[PDB]
Amino acid sequence: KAYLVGLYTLTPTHPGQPIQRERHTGFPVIWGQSLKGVLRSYLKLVEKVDEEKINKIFGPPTAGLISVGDAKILFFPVRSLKGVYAYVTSPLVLNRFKRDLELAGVKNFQTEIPELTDTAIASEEITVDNKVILEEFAILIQKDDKGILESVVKAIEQAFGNEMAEKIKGRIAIIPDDVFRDLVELSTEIEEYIPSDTLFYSLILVTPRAKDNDMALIKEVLGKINGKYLQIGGNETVGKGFVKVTLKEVT
């Protein structure tokens, strides 16, 4: 009934001049329309699925069985003094991730996420003298009594796969929302690009009126996207906009 999508940037990516951003936060987003077009053009040209099957699941590019949501940033790569770089997230981002999971039907991720104002919760591999040095900023670490990092890593594994989990594991740093906001606004690759090693997530929801014969078709076609590589945005000819795509079914 619902599919979760992961987008991991392998190259500097410009979805589309400044990049597309959410109004009231300043967070970079990949617009659902754009992602839907990237997906259906992939299944058409690369996987070579029939015109009719694609026209039934996505509908003509103007009447579709599924809905492709916007892709939001879950982890953003920031230069770290220890561990070279860190995957940076915030309580707001993680809470949105929970909220979108509940919208998808997931009741697994219910771990309490502490509000952070002056402290961070990071892995040992990126921490020095009880601190995490992201670029210029220096943030005092806070002990992980609730076992939040391990729960996050578990969530990543359940959501995007085991490889994605191992990739992020050891470099996670939950920081204040303001610091995250400032980073993702000022630590962009500069034409403004979204830096490599950025993890987006998107929701694919199936219409309630979908018959069971539709369910099988959606499963068959969308399954050909998991663990594949897609191109998103401009400047494709200079090796940019390449993303590893994961597609896990939600139970």
Swiss-Prot record:
Disulfide linkage: none
UniProt GO MF annotations: endonuclease activity; RNA binding
Result for mutant: H14A: Significant decrease in cleavage of target RNA in the whole Cmr complex
Localization, UniProt: Cytoplasm
Keyword Secreted: no
InterPro entries assigned to the protein according to its UniProt record, in alphabetical order: CRISPR-assoc_RAMP_Cmr4, RAMP_III_fam
Class of the enzyme per the UniProt entry, highest EC level: hydrolase
Subunit structure: Forms oligomers in isolation. Part of the type III-B Cmr ribonucleoprotein (RNP) complex, an elongated RNP with Cmr2 and Cmr3 as the base, with Cmr4 and Cmr5 forming a helical core along the mature crRNA (39 or 45 nt in length), while the complex is capped by Cmr6 and Cmr1. The 5' end of the crRNA is bound to Cmr2 and Cmr3, while Cmr6 and a Cmr1 subunit (Cmr1-1 or Cmr1-2) cap the 3' end of the crRNA.
Family according to the record: Belongs to the CRISPR system Cmr4 family.
Function description: CRISPR (clustered regularly interspaced short palindromic repeat), is an adaptive immune system that provides protection against mobile genetic elements (viruses, transposable elements and conjugative plasmids). CRISPR clusters contain sequences complementary to antecedent mobile elements and target invading nucleic acids. CRISPR clusters are transcribed and processed into CRISPR RNA (crRNA), formerly called psiRNA (prokaryotic silencing) in this organism.
Name assigned to this protein: CRISPR system Cmr endoribonuclease Cmr4
Organism: Pyrococcus furiosus (strain ATCC 43587 / DSM 3638 / JCM 8422 / Vc1)
